[PDB]
Design a protein around this ligand. Structure first.
Ligand SMILES: [Mg+2]
Ligand SMILES: [Zn+2]
Lengths: 49, 277, 79, 50, 1350, 50, 49, 99
DNA sequence: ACGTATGCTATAATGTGTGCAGTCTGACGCGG
């Protein structure tokens, strides 16, 4: 997987909601990971590593 | 909260005295004369110093938690024998102890096959001499090239390199792919399979019939000597203990039993056939 | 006998108790050195035991009677 | 030289082998004609035209 | 060495000391130069024993002269090295340490017993907070955690009167103080008060643990280890390599971590060091102990040299790679060889080629044996050399022993029992094994480079077993289906096909022969073709009333080839069977016929002869694969060129803006789909009867002798499906996403693909072969899952003495009867005197085998439904009876007692799935005349004048003249019927019609449409067009829906002209149809409607070929009993329905039975529609809601024979879709095992009481003594169990740990102190004893009478 | 594992073991070459004004 | 590999499931006969003895 | 490949694996269930003990075959005797309770 | 005497971190 940025979405993490939760992820060549992700209530979260 | 044994201890040292020059002397003077609480403090205080010393002695043999424990034992022996009357600081004196106690405990619990300090100490100088040579030879030094710079024995260098030879665990995968380890390959030495077990059983049973098929006074001083039928393997002179009580007649009767048995192997179809074996 | 073992299963019934009866008889000829009832015709114990069962000479009742008949001869004789 | 099974073909659907066979035969047919003229020791112009 | 049981209990510190022969106090393995144990080290000989057989270390006492002498200097005994893996050790832990398996292996166990959480205990262990052991001053109560601050507060204020400590020391004291006697009574009292579900569950589990703990004799203190056992050094080896290197197991390394830290703690307790350091040392010690027992569990597994984790103890007992599965159930085996297999077309069925040099090494001890007998060898090393030299006369002895000696041939993978078959080895010079072509089917062995393992049966019993059970001749039919697996294929079928198949005149037409020998005479003479119509004299034999065979001579008009085949045909079968052109499907009946008539012998001969003549005549034919054989139809370029312009037409309409992209996408697929079937049929119409050019006088029409067609028509290789790709059109390919390409592949393999056509072919090709590798593991794992639960089932009794059975009914669906009352009830013992229609004379008795001939009389009498003696209806405790099972389908007559079915069943089910890896149903046309008979149907007439159906599961029957069901269909919801209920229809009439790519929502009432909870943006969306502006509304579901309109249900409410609701006829329900997600709506708000109009259309995309990849997970879920996410509701007890109270649409139901006074309430969703409409006569388990049925819901209400009928239908539906043939009895086996445990409801004579869930057989044995003694009955209610769970439930813990969850099984079994007395197979295969089944059944029961006799 | 339409000209659709390491391992295309940054690239004939 | 005159047809089941029937004349020309260079080693070690 | 009797494993005490090391073919659990289905009980017990671990069995059986007496003489595989001590090393009382 | 083991040094130094992060369906177990 090529370093840089990448936008994905588990088309239904919780098929309970069945909501397409969109997420972004910064992939470096060396360094820590930087992810941004929504949730059932569309609250933006960040999860380093 | 915190459930890492590492961070828990590292927390408890982070809340411990950080002593001044005259503080060290006040506690230490009472510590030698046994204040109990004093010996506890100086120690509690300088656990932080043990951690920074184990930070440089890590990733070499044992874990960081194993260096701190044995590094703490160096600080304690430093407290058991410090000189407060001397104007020189404690942090200086304790460092010599904590660096020593760590190195020593690594030399023991690093290798599976226990290597005493003598063989090890020397090994290091052979290896550290290899550094010098490697940089200027640009070629990893041979057993000879190390022997020519120290002017020391060839077998010494070689035998010390044999003890450096490291291990592969039996349960280690093969080809970087969980398929089969070494135990699912490595044979058992001790027990040879039925074919070798029945070899000796059949070979010995035939021998028992051969002794009963030979003369009764010829297999009485032959099997009792070699320890075939008897209980102890005696010699020509020792067969005199039984009933023979002879040295010349025992040697003539031993060989007479073997001569008639050599004709028994030429007629069965062995002799030169079973000579290769 | 060599290909078929159905003719042997016809006589006893249980495919499993057939192997046990045939084995026990095969062992008597293999160890005791007992005589085969059917012409052996260069076949191993395996086949011969099946032949005797197939034609109807060997049975659970037959072999148990014959056992204690050799063993009762020994009883009367000893004491 | 070898006798292959024709049933290892329909189910497989690898008709390339049959075309390999046909062309190989044609190719050999041409070698067999050239082999014959070289054995017969004919001519440079006759081989050239063919 | 001969025992009865195996026990598991908790290791007491005192107990561990009993096994240990010393205390390892040093990490020292060996000395560096002197390769010998160190002083009280990990390889110490003073603790674990001596090195060699009878030799001390220093060398003072040697061999047996000093039998059991203990040396002075080194202090080492002189016994065998035997003891180095038997003798254990121990370590005296300075401070007590907790067991990870009684802390982390959930349930907590140590925490479950204390009534204490995990966090609380762990923070005590890692020294974060103290815990109270016992407060004298009631100020602090027990098991109350105090932070480091809160401990100090109680110390100066209260102190002393409160005893609280920290670390594993504390929790041990807590376990040592707690009273199992008192806290058991306390919990029982709290249970009498007001009991719920969760409260009673928790209490009962704890209660039983407490009683179990007292009766197991275990003490809760042993959860904490004061003593730590050491594994014998030979079991954690330090052995030297040939290369001068050494190697050690990771246990030795993990042991050195434990001993070092433990000894360092002894040192720090000597120094009285400050507690902060002692804390780290205790945390470390625990880390090391927990890493030794189970490394990867509590935290990071301690990684070692090659950055990999150290293999711990638990790991060698854990899962695949553990001792069970890898080094105990699975073994490499002697008298074994494997090699490339090749064909053996010369062999008979009972024969197989075995290389000489293979059989040489294999039969090594049998050569040495026969050699000493002849007197050629005096001893064995003499015989060894005789063999080595490979001298001439040794081959002749080897050749002697092998005769009349069977060998086992295995092929991987071993799916079903037939994966091994025995033969009589035939020595062949060559390193290749030669296998019999007909049994290739059982192994699935392709000669494309397959290898087969050989095994020599040593014991005479094994020679008899191999010849009796495992011989290829005794194994014909599959156990799965009563059908022959030994059946020609490939060349053999083609050869017979060529022979029988006929042709016009030819050489010597209409000639006249004495016999089938004159036909061989004339063909091989060159004066007749195998395809000549001829009159011949044949004598066909037919059997009499008794065994006597009658002969009958007759003239037959057949071909020269058919005549020659009659020669192979045994006399007893009719001639009409070979009078047709023989194919694979026809040939499979020949062998079956031959078997059911003559017997075994005749078939084996017949089988071989069929094979021989098949190969020979196949090779005589010269059948080939030319490229002119791949005939393309005349007019392919005519079909495509104009089917392209068809698609080009819509393409221009789309860009204009009328036909939408989605409609075009479906519309273009239909054009290509028609063109594809157009080319396919034009191809075979020009290829099947290509031979239209004959002779005789002028012309005649005839079957085509095109090589490819013959090879497909005969059923030899390929089919009409494959030929399509060859000569016709490749067809439409599929994207890796799942969507189908609009443009398919026009070319075929003859014409050549272009560059993309291949690129497109790839997508489908790689994903099809990806599911060959990956999806096989789910199907192979199913085989494993099924087996473990069905291990114990063996035929035990002869007659269970029960007159119960499941009532099987003829399976009819799709128009053609899927499984008739004949096929479905064959080999099933009648459980009920079932006679003929006229109930006045008995036709069939009770306990009787239903044979095919007896089944023929079922056809004459036309049986309606039969109560078959089933497996689940069996009363035999621990197994089943031969009557309940019926015939062994593999054999062909009633099953032997002792035969182990459960395993045979599991194999039969998993075998096909593992080897096994155009829905335009627009309209039903009825074919025979009949009266239309609908059932479970509620329709309503529409504006048009058409009977529209408003019920989901509507079935359509076809009733004949006398009044019996011939054809059967599934009419779906909102389908339009041509004729209603009871009306006559003619043959070839469309009785029903509907749109397949849509699921309409149809009304029952007329009036106007109202929008309720259809807010734009929250629940639905809107999209308009142009000039006028027709807008469509699309209903969003919880996936495309915001949090605003989540509890809003969108529905199209019906109203009248005034604006009020319209009641649905004969109910108080205002009309309201709830629309589901992605529902497309064309009518907007304020539109007039009649009854029968479509309100919305729900899209029904189903373009995924289910195949076997996407239908086995459905089988799994069924067996594993996983409730669906929309279960259908059923009525509990019979009586009067009475609708009750409601909660924002959530419906309740206050059902008040006629006899039962106490009401029963159950809740129902809003969006879900029911089937019944209130105030009704409901019975036990009527269908209330529609959708997937929950397996637990079925047995709970409608009993055993309802859930068994469900699983059997449901499972088979998936396998029938794939053409997998399995007898229902095999599924019924697993079903039975899934009904093993049962919850008790009512107190009994034994201390059963409520909440306990015991096995069904044990509780029924108690009921046996109860009806004899009186006392109190133990009433019950059978529960259903999933496979994975049913395996772990068996009282055998050995069988459970051997399966999975091995870490948990053992811990639960240790705490219970359970003793396994061994009943299962896994149990006795492990210990390497006689299997309590099959051959061993006769032996194991002869030991059971040793126990019975006193 | 599935063949992706990017593979065109870059990676071969028919070159990969049929074993569990099926779709991951892949041979490079004939005229395929590495992009100066890392991605793949395939030759293409430019069309100038038709 | 090597090309050769091949003929597609069954032969008494010696080409059953893709099984191959090769002439002795192929074996006579030794044309599919292969070469296998195998490397074996002998190590003189220094044992404790 | 072919094998009658040869090398034996280090702890499992069953034969090694492959013609590389001269090891017998593996008879896995799937191979085992096949014989369970047949009913052939000795053929399996023979392949669990004398042909694999059973140290008494393998050598004893060898001697019986050369004598001609192909007689079943089981004892109990070492790999199980290992599993007993392995569970005892994990602090669990696992003893063989007799008749 | 030989091999192994135990012992001390005095500039000052006083709180670690390290390393793979497209597995996945299914099933419980503690809080909230
Ligand atoms: Mg294959
Ligand atoms: Zn000694």
């Amino acid at each position: 997987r090529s370093p840089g940025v990448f936008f994905d979405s588990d088309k239904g993490k919780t098929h309970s909601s069945g909501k397409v939760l969109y997420n972004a992820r910064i992939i470096p060549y060396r360094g820590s990971w930087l992810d941004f992700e929504f949730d059932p209530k569309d609250n933006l979260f960040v999860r380093i590593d | 909260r915190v459930l890492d044994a590492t961070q828990l201890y590292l927390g408890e040292i982070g809340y411990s005295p950080l002593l001044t020059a005259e503080e060290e002397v006040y506690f230490a003077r009472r510590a030698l004369r046994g204040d109990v609480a004093s010996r506890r403090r100086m120690i509690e205080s300088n656990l932080r110093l043990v951690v920074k010393i184990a930070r440089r002695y890590g990733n070499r043999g044992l874990a960081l938690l194993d260096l701190i424990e044995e590094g703490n034992l160096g600080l304690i022996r430093a407290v058991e024998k410090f000189d407060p009357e001397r104007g020189f600081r404690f942090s200086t004196y304790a460092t010599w102890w904590i660096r020593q106690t760590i190195e020593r405990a690594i030399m023991n619990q690093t290798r599976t096959i226990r290597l005493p300090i003598h063989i090890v100490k020397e090994l290091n100088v052979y290896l550290r001499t290899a550094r010098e040579l490697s940089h200027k030879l640009d070629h990893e030094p041979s057993a000879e090239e190390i022997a020519e710079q120290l002017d020391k024995p060839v077998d010494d260098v070689s035998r010390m390199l044999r003890l450096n030879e490291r291990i592969t665990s039996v349960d280690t995968p093969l080809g970087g792919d969980s398929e089969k380890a070494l135990l699912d390959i490595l044979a058992d030495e001790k027990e040879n399979g039925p074919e070798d077990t029945t070899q000796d059983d059949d070979m010995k049973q035939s021998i028992v019939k051969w002794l009963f098929e030979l003369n009764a006074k010829q297999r009485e001083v032959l099997a009792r000597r070699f320890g075939l039928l008897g209980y102890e393997a005696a010699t020509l002179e020792d067969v005199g203990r039984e009933i023979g009580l002879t040295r010349e007649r025992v040697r003539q009767i031993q060989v007479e039993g073997l001569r008639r048995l050599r004709e028994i192997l030429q007629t069965q179809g062995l002799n030169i056939e079973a000579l290769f074996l | 006998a060599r290909v078929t073992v159905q003719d042997a299963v016809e006589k006893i019934g249980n495919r499993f108790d057939l192997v046990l009866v045939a084995a026990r008889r095969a062992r008597q000829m293999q160890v005791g050195g007992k005589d085969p009832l059917v012409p052996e015709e260069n076949d191993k114990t395996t086949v011969i035991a099946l032949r005797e069962i197939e034609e109807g000479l060997i049975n659970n009742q037959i072999l148990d009677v014959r056992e204690r008949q050799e063993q009762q001869e020994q009883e009367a004789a000893e004491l | 030289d070898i006798v292959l099974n024709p049933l290892g073909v329909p189910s497989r659907m690898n008709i390339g082998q049959i075309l390999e066979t046909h062309l190989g035969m044609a190719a050999k047919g041409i070698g067999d004609k050239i082999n014959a003229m070289l054995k017969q020791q004919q001519e440079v112009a006759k081989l050239r035209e063919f | 060495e001969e025992f009865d049981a195996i026990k598991i209990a908790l290791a007491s510190p005192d107990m561990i000391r009993s096994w240990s022969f010393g205390e390892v106090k040093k990490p020292e393995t060996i000395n560096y130069r002197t390769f010998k144990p160190e002083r009280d080290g990990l390889f110490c000989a003073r603790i674990f024993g001596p090195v060699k057989d009878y030799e001390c270390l220093c060398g003072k006492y040697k061999r047996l002269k000093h039998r059991g002498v203990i040396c002075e200097k080194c202090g080492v005994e002189v016994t065998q090295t035997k003891v180095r893996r038997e003798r254990m050790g121990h370590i005296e832990l300075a401070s007590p340490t907790a067991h990870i398996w009684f802390l982390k292996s959930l349930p907590s166990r140590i925490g479950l017993l204390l009534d204490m959480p995990l966090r609380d205990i762990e923070r005590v262990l890692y020294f974060e907070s103290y815990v109270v052991i016992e407060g004298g001053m009631t100020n602090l109560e027990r098991q109350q955690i105090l932070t480091e601050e809160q401990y100090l507060d109680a110390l100066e204020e209260f102190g002393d009167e409160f005893d609280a400590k920290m670390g594993a020391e504390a929790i041990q004291a807590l376990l040592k103080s707690m009273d199992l006697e008192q806290e058991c009574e306390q919990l029982r009292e709290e249970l009498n008060e007001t009991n719920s579900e969760t409260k009673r569950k928790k209490l009962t589990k704890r209660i039983k643990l407490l009683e179990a703990f007292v009766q197991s004799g275990n003490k809760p203190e042993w959860m904490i280890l004061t003593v730590l056992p050491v594994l014998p050094p030979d079991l954690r080896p330090l052995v030297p390599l040939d290369g001068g290197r050494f190697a050690t197991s990771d246990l030795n390394d993990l042991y050195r971590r434990v001993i070092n830290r433990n000894n360092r703690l002894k040192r720090l307790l000597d120094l009285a060091a400050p507690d902060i350091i002692v804390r780290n040392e205790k945390r470390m010690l625990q880390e090391a102990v927990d890493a030794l027992l189970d490394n990867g569990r509590r935290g990071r597994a301690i990684t070692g040299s090659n950055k990999r984790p150290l293999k711990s103890l638990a790991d060698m007992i854990k899962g695949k790679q553990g001792r069970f599965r890898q080094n105990l159930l699975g073994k490499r085996v002697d008298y074994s060889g494997r090699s490339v297999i090749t064909v053996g077309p010369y062999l008979r069925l009972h024969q197989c080629g075995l290389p000489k040099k293979m059989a040489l090494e294999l039969f090594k001890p049998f050569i040495y044996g026969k050699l000493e007998l002849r007197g050629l060898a005096t001893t064995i090393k003499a015989a060894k050399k005789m063999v080595e030299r490979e001298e001439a006369v040794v081959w002749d002895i080897l050749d002697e022993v092998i005769r009349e000696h069977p060998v086992l041939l295995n092929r991987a993978p071993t799916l079903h029992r037939l994966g091994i078959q025995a033969f009589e080895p035939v020595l062949i010079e060559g390193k290749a094994i030669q296998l019999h072509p007909l049994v290739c089917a059982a192994y699935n062995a392709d000669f494309d480079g397959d290898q087969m393992a050989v095994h020599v049966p040593l014991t005479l019993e094994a020679q008899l077993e191999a010849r009796a059970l495992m011989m290829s001749t005794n194994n014909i039919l599959s156990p799965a289906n009563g059908e022959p697996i030994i059946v020609p294929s490939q060349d053999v079928v083609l050869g017979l096909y060529y022979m029988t198949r006929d042709c016009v005149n030819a050489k010597g037409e209409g000639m006249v022969l004495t016999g089938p020998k004159e036909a061989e005479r004339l063909y091989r003479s060159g004066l007749a073709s195998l395809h000549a119509r001829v009159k011949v004299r044949i004598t066909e034999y037919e059997k009499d009333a008794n065994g006597e065979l009658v002969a009958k001579t007759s003239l037959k008009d057949t071909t020269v080839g058919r005549a020659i085949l009659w020669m192979i045909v045994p006399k007893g079968l009719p001639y009409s069977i070979v009078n047709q052109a023989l194919g694979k499907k026809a040939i499979s009946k020949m062998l079956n016929t031959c078997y059911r008539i003559l017997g075994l012998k005749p078939t084996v001969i017949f089988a071989d002869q069929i094979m021989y003549t098949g190969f020979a005549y196949a090779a005589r034919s010269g059948a080939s694969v030319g490229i002119d054989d791949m005939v393309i139809p005349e007019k392919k370029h005519e079909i495509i060129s104009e089917a392209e312009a068809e698609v080009a037409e819509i393409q221009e309409q789309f860009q204009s803006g009328l036909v939408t992209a989605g409609e075009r996408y479906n519309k273009v697929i239909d054009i290509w789909a028609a063109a594809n079937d157009r080319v396919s049929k034009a191809m075979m119409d020009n290829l099947q009867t290509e031979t239209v050019i004959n002779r005789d006088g002028q012309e005649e029409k005839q079957v085509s002798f095109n090589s490819i067609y013959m090879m497909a028509d005969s059923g030899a290789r390929g089919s009409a499906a494959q030929i399509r790709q060859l000569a016709g059109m490749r067809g439409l390919m599929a994207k890796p996403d799942g969507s189908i390409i609009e443009t398919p592949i026009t070319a075929n393999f003859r014409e050549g693909l272009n560059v993309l056509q291949y690129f497109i072919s790839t997508h489908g090709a790689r994903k099809g072969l990806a599911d060959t590798a990956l999806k096989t593991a789910n199907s192979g794992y199913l085989t494993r899952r099924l087996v473990d639960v069905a291990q114990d089932l063996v035929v035990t009794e002869d007659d269970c003495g029960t007159h119960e059975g499941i009532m099987m009914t003829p399976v009819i669906e799709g128009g053609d009867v899927k499984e008739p009352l004949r096929d479905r009830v064959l080999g099933r013992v009648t459980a009920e005197d079932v006679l003929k229609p006229g109930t006045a004379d008995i036709l069939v008795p009770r306990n009787t085998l239903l044979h095919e001939q007896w089944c023929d009389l079922l056809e004459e009498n036309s049986v309606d439904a039969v109560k078959v003696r089933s497996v689940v209806s069996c009363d035999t405790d621990f197994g089943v009876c031969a009557h309940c099972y019926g015939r062994d389908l593999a054999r062909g007559h009633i099953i032997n007692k002792g035969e182990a079915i459960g395993v045979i069943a599991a194999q039969s089910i998993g075998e096909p799935g593992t080897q096994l890896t155009a829905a335009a149903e627009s309209s039903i046309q009825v074919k025979n005349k009949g009266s239309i008979k609908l059932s479970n149907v509620k329709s309503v007439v529409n504006s048009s004048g058409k009977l529209v159906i408003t019920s989901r599961n509507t079935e359509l029957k076809l009733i004949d003249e006398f009044g019996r069901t011939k054809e059967s269909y599934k009419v779906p919801y909102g389908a339009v019927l041509a004729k209603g209920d009871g009306e006559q229809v003619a043959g070839g009439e469309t009785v029903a019609n509907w749109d397949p790519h849509t699921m309409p929502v149809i009304t029952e009432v007329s009036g106007f449409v109202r929008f309720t909870d259809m807010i734009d943006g929250q629940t639905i969306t809107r999209q308009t067009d142009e000039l006028t502006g027709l807008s469509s509304l699309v209903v969003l579901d919880s996936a495309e829906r915001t949090a605003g309109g989540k509890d809003l249900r969108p529905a199209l409410k019906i109203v009248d002209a005034q604006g009020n609701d319209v009641l649905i006829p004969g109910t108080d329900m205002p009309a309201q149809y709830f629309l589901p997600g992605k529902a497309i709506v064309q009518l907007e708000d304020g539109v007039q409607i009649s009854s029968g109009d479509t309100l919305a259309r729900i899209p029904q995309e189903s373009g995924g070929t289910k195949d076997i990849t996407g239908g086995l997970p459905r089988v799994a879920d069924l067996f594993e009993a996983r409730r669906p996410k929309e279960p259908a509701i059923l009525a509990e007890i019979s009586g009067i329905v009475s609708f009750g109270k409601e909660t924002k649409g959530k419906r309740r139901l206050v059902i008040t039975p006629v006899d039962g006074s106490d009401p029963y309430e159950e809740m129902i969703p809003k969006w879900r529609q029911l089937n019944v409409f209130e105030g009704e006569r409901v019975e036990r388990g009527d269908v209330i809601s529609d959708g997937p049925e929950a397996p637990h819901d079925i047995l709970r209400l409608r009993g055993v024979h309802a859930v068994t009928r469900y699983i059997v239908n449901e499972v088979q539906d998936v396998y029938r879709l794939q053409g997998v043939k399995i007898n229902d009895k095999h599924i019924e086996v697993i079903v039975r095992q899934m009904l093993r445990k049962a919850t008790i409801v009512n107190a009994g004579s034994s201390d059963f009481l409520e909440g306990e869930q015991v096995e069904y057989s044990r509780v029924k044995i108690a009921n046996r003594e109860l009806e004899a003694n009186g006392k109190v009955g133990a009433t019950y209610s059978r529960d259903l169990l999933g496979i994975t769970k049913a395996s772990l439930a068996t009282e055998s813990f050995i069988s459970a740990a051997s399966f999975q969850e091995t870490t948990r099984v053992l811990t639960e079994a240790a705490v219970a102190g359970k003793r396994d007395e061994l009943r299962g197979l896994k149990e006795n295969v492990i210990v390497g004893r006689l299997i309590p089944a099959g051959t061993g059944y006769a032996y194991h029961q002869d030991r059971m009478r040793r126990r019975a006799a006193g | 594992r599935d063949v992706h339409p990017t593979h065109y000209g870059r990676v071969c659709p028919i070159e990969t073991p049929e074993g569990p390491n099926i779709g991951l391992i892949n041979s490079l295309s004939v005229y395929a070459q590495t992009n100066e940054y890392g991605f793949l690239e395939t030759p293409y004939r430019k069309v100038t004004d038709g | 590999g090597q090309n050769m005159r091949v003929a597609f047809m069954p032969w008494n089941g010696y080409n059953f499931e893709d099984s191959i029937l090769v002439s002795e004349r192929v074996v006579q020309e030794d044309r599919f006969t292969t070469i296998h260079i195998q490397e074996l080693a002998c190590v003189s070690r220094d044992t404790k003895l | 490949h072919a094998r009658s009797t040869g090398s034996y494993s280090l702890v499992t005490q069953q034969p090694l694996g492959g013609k590389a090391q001269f090891g017998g073919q593996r008879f896995g659990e799937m191979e085992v269930w096949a014989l369970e289905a047949y009913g052939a009980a000795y053929t399996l017990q023979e392949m669990l003990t004398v042909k694999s671990d059973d140290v008494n069995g393998r050598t004893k059986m060898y001697k019986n075959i050369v004598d001609g007496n192909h007689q079943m003489e089981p004892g109990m595989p070492e790999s199980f005797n290992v599993l007993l001590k392995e569970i005892r090393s994990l602090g669990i009382n696992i003893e063989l309770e007799d008749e």
